[PDB]
Amino acid sequence: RKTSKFMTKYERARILGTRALQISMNAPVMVELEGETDPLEIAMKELRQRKIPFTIRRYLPDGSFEEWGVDELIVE
Amino acid sequence: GNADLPGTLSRRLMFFMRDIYAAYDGTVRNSFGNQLVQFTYETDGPVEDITGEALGSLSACALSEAAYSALDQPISLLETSPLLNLKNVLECGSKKG
Amino acid sequence: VESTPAPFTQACFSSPSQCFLKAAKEGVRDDLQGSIDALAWGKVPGFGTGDQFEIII
Amino acid sequence: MFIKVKLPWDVTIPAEDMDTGLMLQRAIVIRLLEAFSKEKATKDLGYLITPTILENIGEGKIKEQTGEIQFPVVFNGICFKMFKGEIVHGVVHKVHKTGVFLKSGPYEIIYLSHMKMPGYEFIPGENPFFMNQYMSRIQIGARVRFVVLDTEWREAEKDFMALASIDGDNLGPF
Amino acid sequence: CMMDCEAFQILDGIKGQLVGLSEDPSIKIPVSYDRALAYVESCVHYTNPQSVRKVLEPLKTYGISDGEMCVIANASSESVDEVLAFIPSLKTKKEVINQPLQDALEELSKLKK
Amino acid sequence: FRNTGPVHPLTRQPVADRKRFGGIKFGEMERDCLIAHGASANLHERLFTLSDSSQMHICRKCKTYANGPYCRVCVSSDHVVRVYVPYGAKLLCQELFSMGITLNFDTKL
Amino acid sequence: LQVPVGTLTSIGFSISNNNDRDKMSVLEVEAPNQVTDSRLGLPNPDSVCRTCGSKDRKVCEGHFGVINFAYSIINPYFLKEVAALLNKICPGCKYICRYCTLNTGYPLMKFRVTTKEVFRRSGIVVEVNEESLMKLKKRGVLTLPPDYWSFLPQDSNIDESCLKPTRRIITHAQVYALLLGIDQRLIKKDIPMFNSLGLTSFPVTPNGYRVTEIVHQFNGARLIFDERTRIYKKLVGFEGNTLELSSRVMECMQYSRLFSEKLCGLRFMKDVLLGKRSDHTFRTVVVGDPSLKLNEIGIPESIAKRLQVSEHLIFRSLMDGDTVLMNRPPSIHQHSLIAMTVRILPTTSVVSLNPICCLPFRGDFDGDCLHGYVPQSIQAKVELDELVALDKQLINRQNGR
Amino acid sequence: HSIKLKHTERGIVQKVVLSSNDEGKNFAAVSLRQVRSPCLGDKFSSMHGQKGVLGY
DNA sequence: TCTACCGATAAGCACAACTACCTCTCCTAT
RNA sequence: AGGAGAGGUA
DNA sequence: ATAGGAGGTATTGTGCTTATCGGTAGA
């Protein structure tokens, strides 16, 4: 709660990088990709299909934190 | 020989404004102790989606651009160059005497 | 005035020796809150990337 | 002192197999098995065999190197502590002139010194040396009870070596 | 808490689980399994319910520490002179009469047929 | 251009000689610009990974520096943590110890 | 063996004492000729380390050694605090007394530290106020009373100075004598670090950071070593007056790289921690090529085949589709850093850039050189074209145009 | 010992000169020559202050 | 009437007087 | 191999 | 270990830390 409920560019880039690193280490892909040979493309496809099993923990300055998920958040 | 002024001014301003960043609550806070600099960003619109960008770093870079661009340094009699005027304006605590 | 001790950033700004000596005499504690302090010790600044964390579940 | 105490761990799981959410618990236990298997040793705790009971699991922390994710899991298991003043039986493996071997399980090696049992003369007239001077025959395979002493440890192997003393009563096989 | 009886019962489960899906994609260690088969074959009890309950009865009725129970149970002394010579913590004590201890020795004798 | 080459004897950094496969210095202005852009992985790699990379051992019990690792201030302890810091940090710590300043480190893990 | 990883935080600052100095030092001998011992550092002329294993100055750290002093030495950093404290408290009354009342004829005393003015020694020299001396002079008193300096115990470390009867150099032994009888609360308030009052040892720089075993042109094994090393070796044999030893220690402490005097002070910080050099970097002259796209950078085939990138299947040559970080020094704005896709061109020893993209770099094709950075980590590449790419920087952040 | 050419050193041997001083120290000089055709990155200047590099 | 700090006037003391850079020559006492 | 001094580039 | 008189001349520039220099205010 008390959040913009919008995925920022930095968080999206970090999620894409983490997913690409995971895929590049021979990891199964939740989404089905046809004719894809680049981990970045598969990560972007999964982000567009919001099937990534990742959760975002936003640290508030006061010390508290709020737990969010990539499926709950929207991508502009 | 006076090309050191923009570099030194930019370095000092960046050292001062590096810790400034925007928080998730919409406030502007400093990295040292979460000090509140601005309760709400004073931008005149139109998009308020900036959350993690370092506003202080951007402002310091813009002022560095202004300083480096104004390197003509005419320094006329009874007058000061735009770089000198910017340096005098940015330094307020030094001119206490 | 803010009661925030940053010996490392002050030393990196100007006169590192005097700043370090004063910090040692005062026995202050540095929390590495600054971005430059984190960078000098191999840590992310946390402004754009690093402010949040990723958890599988 | 076979008290089943809890022991937290920070087992890391490679990103080679991260799928099957409905059967994700299958991958967690497999990684836990490979955790203590790699070490298979302890300094002052003892030994662990199987994770019979799993208490709780923690949040998955992601560390950005070689695609590794960590999971904090706390569980209870079988442990053994060699406390001072314990009568533990053991089986003999071989008999030598010095350092008589006693095997109280393959988890540790126990050596018998000269100043532990009653004074006797080694019998060289047969193949294995006998200690029948005090009307007691000891051979390989017989269970002999003895008191344990302070145990030592190594640097790499960290073997829980100890010394066997027969100064107590009820010596020899029973 | 498992000394001789409950330790053996749970080890049958893993052996019964080993026969099912014995294949493992990872690398296993044979030292751990050898330490279980070559250590519990010293002393074995018959039944679980009546054995773990009986040994815990003197804990409530009499005053015995946790560390004292483990050494006495594993040693399984068959007389009164041995329990007064093994552990030095029982020297010069009159808290418990020897006659109830002898009765407990008989109670431990009938459990092992 | 440079891929791999000799390092300076004082600091474990690429030499400035062009003929000896020298590197390009990552100045303060470039670091500040990268901070303004908000990319930390590139900045972390350029300052720690591709730059002078070293390791330092800190005892968990006593907040001191231990040279396996072993600190003579306290007894031989099995709880010693390793931190990943640039070699410049170790050089600064050595200089501070030489001048008469002792640093205490309290690791969070 | 194996140690768990950890995160460094909460750095504390304190002044070193004798206990920590002794604990940190390993195999600290007291031989004057063993300054370059084989147990401290690899660059010693034996190529063998006693504490660590054999290495190539990459797996062995610089061990520390601390010499021992026969007599206790006051800490130079606390010299000002002690001098200020002695000025307030009487030298013979130990209260906040012949030295109290002005009717007894004893003038007040001022405690101060001289800096290379009398005997080139940074010590405690007590001085009497000359204004009070003139008052005594006008009343018929010409010389100080013989029992004026009765509060100073006799010290064998005193030498022949003969400077003036009004001024005396306070011996380090006398400093501890005067501090006796003072409440610990007052001393602790002025001096937060009471445990560092006594300096009975001094560390030496490791051979891995002092032994300059440079190739010395022809003398490959010259072992020139550091310069302060001579002073440290000369400090092994200490006897007689302790003021000379204190002056030597103070002089040696000023040879540290942090103290200002080229690689010293703030320049040391800039060249070590602030400014660093990284691998996988190329620097070539840039020319114009309108045929190339704005987001594409021309990379010569001769250099591309030698630059190696890290791709998980271990290095492969640079090819089309890879992204590099271009920058024109000095970086006057954040728009200087632009991520551009690598495009292979038949041209060699030169990089081709679109003339339109010169405005963000604020440069022209007259000799300007662009040095690029090739990211090796996959995450670095992913974040490079999502935040630092040309299409992401279409809106100027200065004026919004 | 021997002296080897560096990464960016190349040419064809033109002449070798051997000489010594009165002290007896021997000196050796080797000259390497090469042709520098106008490359793309070369910079040319005019007689009136015009400065530029080769474009195409 | 004699103490008791209390702001001014000189006298030294300490950093700061720019980036990315590239070549040549000379240097290591007696 | 590290330094000191000069002429120079954007 | 020894050696390297003596000369009128011809960087600023800002902060900081003294000393000293009288100088009134209170009992």
Ligand SMILES: [Mg+2]
């Ligand atoms: Mg130009």
Ligand SMILES: [Zn+2]
């Ligand atoms: Zn320790």
Ligand SMILES: [Zn+2]
């Ligand atoms: Zn070593």
Ligand SMILES: [Zn+2]
């Ligand atoms: Zn007094």
